[PDB]
Amino acid sequence: PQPPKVLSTPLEIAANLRQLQESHDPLIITFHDRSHRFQSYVVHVDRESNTLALDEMIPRDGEKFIENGEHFRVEGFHDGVRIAWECDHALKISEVDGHRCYSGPLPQEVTYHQRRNAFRAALKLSQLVDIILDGAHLKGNGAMRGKLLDISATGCKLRFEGNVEDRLQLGQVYERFKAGNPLGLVDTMVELRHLHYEERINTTFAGVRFHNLSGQAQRKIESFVYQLQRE
Secondary structure: OOOOEEEOOHHHHHHHHHHHHHOOOOEEEEEOOOOOEEEEOEEEEEOOOOEEEEEOOEOHHHHHHHHOOOOEEEEEEEOOEEEEEEEOOOOEEEEEOOEEEEEEOOOOOEEEEOOOOOOOEEOOHHHOEEEEEOOOOOOOOOOEEEEEEEEOOOEEEEEEEEOOHHHOOOOOEEEEEEEOOOOOEEEEEEEEEEEEEEHHHOEEEEEEEEEOOOHHHHHHHHHHHHHHHHO
16 A cells, blocks of 8 residues: 655655656646546746746647636656646746746645555567466366566566456465466466456456565566566
8 A cells, every 4th residue: 555755845846847847757637526637748847936837738628727727636657656736726828939838836745656566567569478377266167378468576467368357356366377488487376456358459457466486486587577677
């Protein structure tokens, strides 16, 4: 679990906002009591002037709510961290070289949340590792063949052809998980944490957590994770 850090100083607040800016990290703007989510970007951060400017709404019609001076929440990711805050102040709509933006004071507080205990390295789609998901509590007939999509020191993301939801159970433990080269995992225990089926591409994705791993198994998983980002 663990809740997000609450950043409450102009120094920290501006530093994180500058990162969203310099990286052009997309923001999702949600207006109070309005379903639709709009997109923006941080385009100006000036701590001395206590000024923050957001990029023109997308869709453009959302600018209407800023004119209405409606309250909204803003959230964006930077290097895996969810940076979020509330804007309850009136913004000024400005236009520079045709590009418009909304500027106002820096938020008094910003939340900083990153929930994963270990970095997940994604595998190139052209180099997916073959895996087998199996165990005594697996429903249906036979072990399930699949592919490894991402992996961290603590778990991994798997891919299975077709819909396999009914053959699995959230929270269930599978003691016969295997992974081919270059991991060479055998008789590994994994616990299903999340899954969903995507009809459009007839694929079920699942997130599992490792359990009771030997040192050798850990060093092998961790060295792969390390190597995956080496490239």
